[PDB]
Structure 1
Amino acid sequence: NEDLPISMENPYKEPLKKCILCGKHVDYKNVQLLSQFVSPFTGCIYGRHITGLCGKKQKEITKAIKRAQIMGFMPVTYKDPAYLKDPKVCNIRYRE
């Protein structure tokens, strides 16, 4: 009668993980955001396993990092040494 379990649409699942830049808007002029995802020694872009971005927002980062090198907005071979103490969101091992 009333007793048996119903079919409902699966509670106790918190809504899915919004990455870090989920509703935000990357620019090519927004160098201090873009310089956060390149390496402070080599200038190379950290990957999706490091940056923790979704594949949508990782690709807008890379399509705007490479947009900004040729326009004269950010340098290729290093992080902007002025913009070095920003919140280190990219997880990387070295010197623990």
Structure 2
Amino acid sequence: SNEDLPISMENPYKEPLKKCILCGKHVDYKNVQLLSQFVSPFTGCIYGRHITGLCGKKQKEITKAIKRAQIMGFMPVTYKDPAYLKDPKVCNIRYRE
């Protein structure tokens, strides 16, 4: 017949599924430096997933890890640890502007 007819295939141009910054990495409640990167530097409020950019699974992990660290003397509650104020900025939030 005709060899130019379209064939059935999966999309070859399909880009790989996007992954969060913490995809494939363990989250531990003792890893305070990682946890402090997802709380406000003035109030210590836990940022939402619209700010952190994490997926559903890691957002739950960070929230559970932060809550465990706060009660076990690893993470401050009312503020963000000053020693970790110079970490790379990964949350899409701006206060002064």
Q: TM-score range by the shorter chain?
A: over 0.9
1:39-76 CA-partner distances (Å, limit 9, x unpaired): 00001100000000001000000000000000000100
| Cα distance between partner residues in 1 of 2:42 and 2:71 | 20
| Gaps in structure 2 of 5+ consecutive residues | none
Q: Secondary structure, in 3 states, of the residue corresponding to 1:75?
A: coil
Of 70-79 and 10-19, deviating more is: 10-19
Sequence identity, in percent? 100
| Cα distance between partner residues in 2 of 1:28 and 1:3 | 58
| Cα distance between partner residues in 1 of 2:4 and 2:77 | 66
Deviation at 1:11, TM superposition (A): 1.4
Deviation at 1:93, TM superposition (A): 2.1
The CA RMSD measured in Å over matched residues stands at: 0.7
Deviation at 1:22, TM superposition (A): 0.3
Deviating 4+ runs (over 4 angstroms): none
TM-score, with normalisation over the residues of structure 1? 0.97
| Cα distance between partner residues in 1 of 2:72 and 2:96 | 33
TM-score, with normalisation over the residues of structure 2? 0.96
| Cα distance between partner residues in 1 of 2:10 and 2:83 | 51
| Cα distance between partner residues in 1 of 2:89 and 2:36 | 11
| Gaps in structure 1 of 5+ consecutive residues | none
| Cα distance between partner residues in 2 of 1:28 and 1:65 | 6
Deviation at 1:3, TM superposition (A): 1.2
| Cα distance between partner residues in 2 of 1:26 and 1:78 | 21
| Cα distance between partner residues in 1 of 2:95 and 2:40 | 12
